[PDB]
Amino acid sequence: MAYYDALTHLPNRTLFQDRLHTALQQAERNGQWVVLMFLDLDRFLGHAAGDRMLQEVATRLSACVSQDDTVARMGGDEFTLLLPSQGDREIALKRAIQVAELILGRLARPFTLEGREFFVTASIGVALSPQDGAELSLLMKNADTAMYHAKEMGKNNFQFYQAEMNARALERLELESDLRRALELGEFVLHYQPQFTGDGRRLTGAEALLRWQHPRRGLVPPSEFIPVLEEIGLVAQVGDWLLAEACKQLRSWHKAKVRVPKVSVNLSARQFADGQLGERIAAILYETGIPPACLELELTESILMSDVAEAMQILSGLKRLGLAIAVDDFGTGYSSLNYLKQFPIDVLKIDRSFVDGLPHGEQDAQIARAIIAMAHSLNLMVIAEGVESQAQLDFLREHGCDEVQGYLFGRPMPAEQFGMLYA
Amino acid sequence: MAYYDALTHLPNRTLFQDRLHTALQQAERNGQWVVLMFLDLDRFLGHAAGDRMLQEVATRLSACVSQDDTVARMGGDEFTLLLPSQGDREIALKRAIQVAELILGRLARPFTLEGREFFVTASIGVALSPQDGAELSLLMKNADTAMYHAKEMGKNNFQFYQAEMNARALERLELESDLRRALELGEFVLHYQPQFTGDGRRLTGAEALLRWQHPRRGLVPPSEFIPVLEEIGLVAQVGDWLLAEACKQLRSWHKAKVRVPKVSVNLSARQFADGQLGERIAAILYETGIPPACLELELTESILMSDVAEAMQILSGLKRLGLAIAVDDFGTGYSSLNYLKQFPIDVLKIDRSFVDGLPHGEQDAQIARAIIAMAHSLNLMVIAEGVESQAQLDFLREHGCDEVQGYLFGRPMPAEQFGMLYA
Numbered sequence: 001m002a003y004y005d006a007l008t009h010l011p012n013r014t015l016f017q018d019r020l021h022t023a024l025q026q027a028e029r030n031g032q033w034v035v036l037m038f039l040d041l042d043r044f045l046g047h048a049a050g051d052r053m054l055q056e057v058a059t060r061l062s063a064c065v066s067q068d069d070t071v072a073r074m075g076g077d078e079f080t081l082l083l084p085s086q087g088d089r090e091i092a093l094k095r096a097i098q099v100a101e102l103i104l105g106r107l108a109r110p111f112t113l114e115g116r117e118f119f120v121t122a123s124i125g126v127a128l129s130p131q132d133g134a135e136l137s138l139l140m141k142n143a144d145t146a147m148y149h150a151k152e153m154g155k156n157n158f159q160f161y162q163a164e165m166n167a168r169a170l171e172r173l174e175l176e177s178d179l180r181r182a183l184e185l186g187e188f189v190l191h192y193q194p195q196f197t198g199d200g201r202r203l204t205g206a207e208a209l210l211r212w213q214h215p216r217r218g219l220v221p222p223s224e225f226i227p228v229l230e231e232i233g234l235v236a237q238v239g240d241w242l243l244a245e246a247c248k249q250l251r252s253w254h255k256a257k258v259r260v261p262k263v264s265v266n267l268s269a270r271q272f273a274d275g276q277l278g279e280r281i282a283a284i285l286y287e288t289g290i291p292p293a294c295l296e297l298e299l300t301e302s303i304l305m306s307d308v309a310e311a312m313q314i315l316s317g318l319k320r321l322g323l324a325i326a327v328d329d330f331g332t333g334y335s336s337l338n339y340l341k342q343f344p345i346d347v348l349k350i351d352r353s354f355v356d357g358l359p360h361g362e363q364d365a366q367i368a369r370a371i372i373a374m375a376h377s378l379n380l381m382v383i384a385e386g387v388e389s390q391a392q393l394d395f396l397r398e399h400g401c402d403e404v405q406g407y408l409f410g411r412p413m414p415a416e417q418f419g420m421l422y423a
Numbered sequence: 424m425a426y427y428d429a430l431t432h433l434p435n436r437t438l439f440q441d442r443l444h445t446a447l448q449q450a451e452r453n454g455q456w457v458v459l460m461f462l463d464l465d466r467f468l469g470h471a472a473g474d475r476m477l478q479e480v481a482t483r484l485s486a487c488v489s490q491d492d493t494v495a496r497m498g499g500d501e502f503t504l505l506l507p508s509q510g511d512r513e514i515a516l517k518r519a520i521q522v523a524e525l526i527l528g529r530l531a532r533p534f535t536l537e538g539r540e541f542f543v544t545a546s547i548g549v550a551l552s553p554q555d556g557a558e559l560s561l562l563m564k565n566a567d568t569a570m571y572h573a574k575e576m577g578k579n580n581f582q583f584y585q586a587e588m589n590a591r592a593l594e595r596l597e598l599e600s601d602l603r604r605a606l607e608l609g610e611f612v613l614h615y616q617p618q619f620t621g622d623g624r625r626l627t628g629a630e631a632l633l634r635w636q637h638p639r640r641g642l643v644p645p646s647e648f649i650p651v652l653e654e655i656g657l658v659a660q661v662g663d664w665l666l667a668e669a670c671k672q673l674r675s676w677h678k679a680k681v682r683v684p685k686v687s688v689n690l691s692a693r694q695f696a697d698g699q700l701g702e703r704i705a706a707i708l709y710e711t712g713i714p715p716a717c718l719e720l721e722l723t724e725s726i727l728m729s730d731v732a733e734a735m736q737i738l739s740g741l742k743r744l745g746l747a748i749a750v751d752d753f754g755t756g757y758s759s760l761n762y763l764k765q766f767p768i769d770v771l772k773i774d775r776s777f778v779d780g781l782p783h784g785e786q787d788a789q790i791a792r793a794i795i796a797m798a799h800s801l802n803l804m805v806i807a808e809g810v811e812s813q814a815q816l817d818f819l820r821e822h823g824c825d826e827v828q829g830y831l832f833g834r835p836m837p838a839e840q841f842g843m844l845y846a
């Protein structure tokens with residue numbers, strides 16, 4: 001079409017502007033964000049090889065974005081990208097960071113024409129609608145301004161139009177950098193929180209809890225760095241380290257006459273979706289010599305109930321491995337009672353938020369009784385988390401809560417102190 | 424832009440084709456459907472008034488479709504519409520029917536130019552991707568073929584490319600036609616199914632159940648015609664008829680010494696979303712002279728839990744009206760236990776599907792015990808629906824189910840027989 005660049009087959013300037021306008025009008029109607037990127041090359045060649053290079057650039061750019069994103073060619077050495085329908089500021093910001101890093105990484109790679117090797121460098125400017133403009137020409141002014149800022153900083157850079165996003169981008173990249181290194185140097189450590197029978201007479205297991213100690217940031221809370229791990233391929237690899245470390249710990253504790261009956265590991269949504277999950281778990285159980293009965297997986301009702309049919313199969317695979325399954329944070333999500341019984345699950349965990357109102361919050365008291373009753377109706381065992389007070393414990397015990405966990409019974413703890421404190 | 428028609432400001436042929444292509448490539452990737460319509464005018468005027476008419480046509484067409492749909496001008500008197508991202512065949516079919524009827528209705532209306540009145544007529548052809556083509560040129564061949572079929576049938580017609588859809592369209596329109604008439608002539612009737620205490624010693628209420636008797640189709644099941652009602656503005660108006668009829672019935676039964684303590688009415692999602700719901704209910708309670716305690720509303724957990732924050736407010740409004748609220752079909756949806764307690768609800772109804780497996784289906788038996796236990800933990804009263812057998816009843820009674828309903832206790836029934844059968 002007259003609307004496409006004859007060489008790269010990408011939309012031309014006018015078509016791209018129409019789609020940008022459309023994306024802006026729609027975003028504004030749905031309270032969504034749009035990312036606009038401008039990209040310039042210094043190249044860095046031959047005439048025919050030149051046009052062949054632009055073609056390779058184009059291919060590489062298309063490969064960095066999804067189905068719904070547009071890549072286009074403004075002219076000469078300038079390309080633009082459009083990432084529409086981003087749910088909010090932060091999704092937009094992360095997706096922009098991710099796409100821009102991906103692009104610079106792909107364009108770093110050498111261009112192999114005439115048998116030989118060439119390099120190009122790129123400068124990228126990024127502007128996010130609506131904040132940097134909800135109108136196409138303002139959004140473009142600002143992406144272009146960011147681009148030139150990116151140039152004024154040297155080779156292979158991306159800048160946002162907002163300084164605040166540039167700062168946040170730089171830090172995010174450093175965090176990612178540190179987390180890769182954390183795994184390489186082993187800066188992660190496992191702490192264990194003990195689990196008891198409702199009376200407190202007895203230790204039923206330990207919940208393993210990832211911590212991260214960085215020399216400068218100090219100790220980073222799991223809630224900060226875990227989501228970052230899963231936003232890369234890092235989490236499966238960290239999960240492997242963790243599972244193996246807990247299995248080894250179990251080994252040492254048994255050797256040292258510390259009778260810990262089992263250990264619980266939390267799983268993210270990403271780990272749960274992984275096709276090799278059960279395979280990697282079996283692999284680790286085999287290396288460490290520990291049986292599946294010693295292990296329990298903890299998944300949130302949001303992870304299980306989003307796609308119930310898929311979850312049924314994944315869970316069934318894991319049970320055939322002989323391991324137990326607990327539904328973490330229970331009561332904070334949306335659950336089919338139907339599938340709660342069909343899923344081969346073992347345990348419900350009463351979220352801390354409900355335990356916190358005990359014993360004199362009517363709402364929290366009734367919700368907690370209800371969970372216990374559900375659990376026992378489905379032959380599930382339930383443990384209350386976040387038990388911090390004698391009164392909470394009295395209530396839960398009085399109403400048949402099977403197991404209990406919380407600061408009242410001692411904080412999360414490194415393995416050796418754990419053994420001594422609960423031997 | 425050179426891409427837009429200078430007169431109507433609609434996209435021109437080439438731009439429309441690009442968006443159609445895009446919509447097809449995307450639909451195919453997401454397993455979605457796309458609707459394409461071709462529209463021709465016979466007009467049916469003056470030169471300046473002519474161009475002003477096309478402009479009015481354009482405005483009218485834009486007003487018939489949503490934000491995301493494209494309207495365009497192929498040339499002369501021909502326009503096209505694109506309705507992308509339709510979830511499946513039937514959504515597509517209904518949406519096409521709806522949009523086409525809307526367009527013919529708007530174009531029926533007179534054009535007021537030079538002070539005077541004019542009429543145009545239109546022929547519409549409709550083709551649905553992927554079935555009538557997943558490639559733009561084939562989809563266009565076929566919409567155009569449908570259009571000419573529409574012409575060969577006379578004025579103001581739409582045809583699908585598939586004969587099967589034309590048949591289904593014609594029938595759907597006749598159904599809609601009949602339902603409007605049904606309401607005008609009162610062909611709807613209420614049947615009532617009685618509700619008892621778990622023992623059976625005692626009648627706690629009656630669930631009202633809409634039926635429709637058509638002279639030719641015979642008796643149409645609620646599941647067939649109710650969704651059609653709500654796909655128009657008909658359901659609020661039928662709901663009003665129904666509520667009023669049940670309140671009147673309650674009047675007569677009390678007059679005639681038939682002690683029916685209350686009546687339950689089912690609500691659709693659409694009725695529930697209506698801003699005037701509580702207002703219209705109060706209005707009807709006032710006209711019929713019956714107090715809110717005599718009334719109970721039945722809503723599905725899917726209606727309540729889709730938007731919990733909105734539902735909380737809507738429900739709170741209804742409770743302030745003094746009426747009771749039951750969660751129908753419970754166990755078949757996704758529910759926050761948290762919001763189950765916060766929502767000011769009164770009753771859970773155990774779906775028939777779980778009662779059906781009783782008493783010897785382990786899964787169904789445990790689910791049903793669990794619901795009863797939940798209900799009583801939250802101080803809710805629960806009734807089992809679809810109780811058909813002595814064994815089912817024994818089980819439910821043994822486990823403290825408060826109330827019961829089903830064919831074992833007698834089918835749904837017209838009011839007067841109801842009174843005599845349960846006085």
Ligand SMILES: Nc1nc2c(ncn2[C@@H]2O[C@@H]3COP(=O)(O)O[C@H]4[C@@H](O)[C@H](n5cnc6c(=O)[nH]c(N)nc65)O[C@@H]4COP(=O)(O)O[C@H]3[C@H]2O)c(=O)[nH]1
Binds near residue numbers: 329386405
């Ligand atoms: N207020 C209160 N809090 C208590 C009490 N007892 C324990 N806690 C804290 O509550 C959290 C319980 O873990 P969770 O619900 O699985 O929730 C976890 C889990 O979802 C995730 N997480 C932790 N470790 C891992 C891991 O190794 N892998 C994965 N995939 N996620 C993890 O991060 C979340 C937070 O972990 P932590 O920061 O260790 O926070 C832990 C624990 O330190 C108490 O009595 N009162």
Ligand SMILES: Nc1nc2c(ncn2[C@@H]2O[C@@H]3COP(=O)(O)O[C@H]4[C@@H](O)[C@H](n5cnc6c(=O)[nH]c(N)nc65)O[C@@H]4COP(=O)(O)O[C@H]3[C@H]2O)c(=O)[nH]1
Binds near residue numbers: 811828
């Ligand atoms: N297998 C079995 N079935 C039994 C038994 N006892 C009753 N039923 C049937 O099960 C349905 C119970 O109604 P529902 O769950 O509210 O489900 C209702 C309700 O959601 C909707 N509906 C019915 N009347 C109205 C109404 O007036 N307004 C609205 N908005 N929806 C209605 O249509 C659905 C079906 O209504 P019906 O066709 O009357 O079907 C009724 C009733 O005839 C039993 O022992 N065994």
Ligand SMILES: [Mg+2]
Binds near residue numbers: 207298
């Ligand atoms: Mg946990």
Ligand SMILES: [Mg+2]
Binds near residue numbers: 329
């Ligand atoms: Mg938690």
Ligand SMILES: [Mg+2]
Binds near residue numbers: 689751
């Ligand atoms: Mg009902």
Ligand SMILES: [Mg+2]
Binds near residue numbers: 752
């Ligand atoms: Mg039902």
